[PDB]
Design a protein around this ligand. Structure first.
Ligand SMILES: NC(=O)c1ccc[n+]([C@@H]2O[C@H](COP(=O)([O-])OP(=O)(O)OC[C@H]3O[C@@H](n4cnc5c(N)ncnc54)[C@H](OP(=O)(O)O)[C@@H]3O)[C@@H](O)[C@H]2O)c1
Ligand SMILES: CCc1nc(N)nc(N)c1OCCCOc1ccccc1CCC(=O)O
Length: 166
């Protein structure tokens, strides 16, 4: 689907229905169903994340296994064992296909370059609070399909969106 001379940038995230994606250095829900989805989309690929998202990764999956982990930071001395640290968005997006995997800051920055968004919406009414990381806002140029609600094993509802643009 992607010619090898191109540079497809895609964003992938999970959000509460309020747009909250992050809080207290973590994701404020647990959803193995979403974890599986995230892996299906990103496995084998270059993935790009902000330094705080690197910090947020559970120790057991830092770096995220089976993927080329790229961490954006302005700290030259940052230690991200098993990953590479780059100081600019430009050096981060050199692969023919890249998945930007968080967090709020990096989604916001990368969106203008992006032509795919893979979104999980969790049916949880978490009000927005000072300091929360939020999902980026998609304008009218985006289009795609909204999947049906499904219950997770725990009875938490979720659904998937698959957006793209030209
Ligand atoms: N629900 C989801 O899908 C999802 C996914 C991922 C993360 N999260 C959550 O989101 C939160 C983190 O998001 P966040 O917005 O706070 O932080 P972030 O985007 O992960 O990372 C921010 C950092 O990235 C670096 N950075 C940003 N722009 C840069 C640029 N142009 N060049 C170089 N470096 C740059 C800076 O690091 P330095 O400060 O080191 O310079 C900055 O502090 C956490 O709560 C996490 O759990 C949620
Ligand atoms: C699974 C959370 C998640 N879900 C979606 N749809 N997009 C993300 N960018 C995302 O965040 C990716 C970074 C945080 O990753 C995790 C956070 C908690 C548990 C497991 C994982 C990823 C597990 C893995 O991919 O090996």
């Amino acid at each position: 689907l992607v010619p090898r001379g191109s540079h497809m940038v895609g964003l992938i995230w999970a959000q509460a229905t309020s747009g909250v994606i992050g809080r207290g250095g973590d994701i404020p829900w647990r959803l193995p169903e979403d974890q599986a989805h995230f892996r299906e989309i990103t496995m084998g690929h270059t993935i790009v994340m902000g330094r705080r998202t690197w910090d947020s990764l559970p120790a057991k999956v830092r770096p995220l296994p089976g993927r080329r982990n790229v961490v954006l930071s302005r700290q030259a001395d940052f230690m991200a064992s098993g990953a590479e640290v780059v100081g600019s968005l430009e050096e981060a997006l050199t692969s023919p296909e890249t998945w930007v995997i968080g967090g709020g800051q990096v989604y916001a920055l990368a969106l203008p370059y992006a032509t795919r968004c893979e979104v999980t919406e969790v049916d949880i009414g978490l009000p927005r609070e000072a300091g929360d990381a939020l999902a980026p806002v998609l304008d009218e140029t985006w289009r795609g399909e909204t999947g049906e609600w499904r219950f997770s094993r725990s009875g938490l509802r979720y659904r998937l969106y698959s957006y793209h643009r030209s």
